[PDB]
Amino acid sequence: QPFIVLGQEEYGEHHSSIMHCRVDCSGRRVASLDVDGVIKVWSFNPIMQTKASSISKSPLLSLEWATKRDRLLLLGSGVGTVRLYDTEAKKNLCEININDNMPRILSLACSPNGASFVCSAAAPSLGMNQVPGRLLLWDTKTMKQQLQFSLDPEPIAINCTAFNHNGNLLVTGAADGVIRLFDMQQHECAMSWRAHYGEVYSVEFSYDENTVYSIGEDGKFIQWNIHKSGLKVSEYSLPSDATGPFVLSGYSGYKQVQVPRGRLFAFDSEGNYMLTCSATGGVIYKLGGDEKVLESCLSLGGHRAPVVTVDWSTAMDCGTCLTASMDGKIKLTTLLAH
Amino acid sequence: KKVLLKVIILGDSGVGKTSLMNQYVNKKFSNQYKATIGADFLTKEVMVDDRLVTMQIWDTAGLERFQSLGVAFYRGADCCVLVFDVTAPNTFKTLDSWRDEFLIQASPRDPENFPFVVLGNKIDLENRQVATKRAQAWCYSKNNIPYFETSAKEAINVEQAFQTIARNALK
Ligand SMILES: Nc1nc2c(ncn2[C@@H]2O[C@H](COP(=O)(O)OP(=O)(O)OP(=O)(O)O)[C@@H](O)[C@H]2O)c(=O)[nH]1
Ligand SMILES: [Mg+2]
Description:
The complex is a heterodimer of chains A (338) and B (171).
Chain A: E1 3-11, E2 18-23, E3 29-34, E4 38-43, E5 49-55, E6 60-65, E7 72-77, E8 81-86, E9 91-97, E10 104-110, E11 116-122, E12 133-139, E13 144-148, E14 158-163, E15 169-174, E16 178-183, E17 189-194, E18 200-205, E19 211-216, E20 220-225, E21 231-237, E22 246-249, E23 255-258, E24 265-267, E25 273-276, E26 283-286, E27 296-299, E28 307-315, E29 318-325, E30 330-337
Antiparallel strand pairs in A: 1-30, 2-3, 3-4, 4-5, 6-7, 7-8, 8-9, 10-11, 11-12, 12-13, 14-15, 15-16, 16-17, 18-19, 19-20, 20-21, 22-23, 24-25, 25-26, 26-27, 28-29, 29-30
Chain B: E1 3-10, H1 17-25, E2 39-47, E3 52-60, H2 71-74, E4 79-85, H3 89-93, H4 95-106, E5 116-121, H5 132-141, E6 147-149, H6 158-169
Parallel strand pairs in B: 1-3, 1-4, 4-5, 5-6
Antiparallel strand pairs in B: 2-3
The complex binds guanosine-5'-triphosphate (GTP) and magnesium ion.
């Protein structure tokens, strides 16, 4: 009832499992990256147009739109670098050298203030991703590491990050199952708590920013009160195919497995509904307070392979859901809110 | 596109912080007084050079002396509203304390230009105790904080205070 489905288009220029798929801040562009290192920046309004295409020689692991300077895409490599890419010039601006011995740039967050980004730099894998890592605030226009955050008790691989609206707060999820909330000028975490028995895969502030959501390897979707140090507000057990591991199998004995690496859950413009992954397509839940189960209010379908990452772009009261799957296909479902 | 601002209202107990907030959002007032217990908020949509701002306005217990709230609450803030009662000079002499306590807990990088507004509330009542010039001078000394004399009872200058912190935060 709340959403009218107007159509579903397919972007098919990737030929490998998608790793990231994110709409820019304007809503007009998508950046998507597959496991074979191919980046596509493309439009869908008014036509599905591949605005740019790169093939990275080195592995790429994370992707993040700039907020102030939209048309800038940040790309975290597997060789300790962060690339700033100009999506309107179709051109690398620079490659910032982050860290020598911790090369997996697992997560990137651009500050809304436009000057800095936080990134996650993890040691190589091999429970394979409970290895150490760094969380660094990098100041782009000074070109130096402004701050390193203390990851108590031991350094740990940070999977996922998200800024609050003014850029003073960063919520993070680590391989050890802990949420850590950091003040952007205290190197000590302002707050941390055990959140999942397993890795935290995605984190996000609620719309009003008085709670944070996490999705974890233990299969649970939990809302936490950040005014009372991660007091569980609500808890839900999502379907098994919302957190994977995501597996594409064939008649040839050849199987692909992918652990959550990308965006696992996405929200409409004010946080009433949540897109998630499934084996057949995106599943949209309402987020009202039944508190025992989430009501599945819409299902997008359209995929022959498991969906591993999602995104939800809102403006116009005209939402736009992206669902990306292991066959490399990206489906774009347009909704109208009522 | 939507923009969130969190607005903190600070000041001594009884200066009219709840009354001012309810007058801004609900547009109504109650002569009955009941002390605010922790911190809690109301939200309203306003707009600024044709851009819609979701303004989350927070009420703080004045008796609580801004102390044991969250970093999540302190660092989430984008505007500070300092309120005193013009018919009560002690509520004015505590302004330096409330502003210092905000700057310590909220810790803005650029305090000089942080969006502050100072409200001398309750000018509907006669028998002012705080001279206008003296409040003007105090607000000026802190690098020209915008100063308003207000009445939540008669809805005088509430819109101006909120618009001012909204515009200056959106910069
Ligand atoms: N005449 C007049 N009375 C006011 C005005 N504003 C508030 N009052 C009265 O002053 C009393 C204090 O009001 P509140 O708004 O609850 O004060 P508060 O700042 O919220 O106090 P705490 O919650 O304890 O920190 C109330 O009884 C109001 O009716 C005003 O502008 N004019
Ligand atoms: Mg009050």
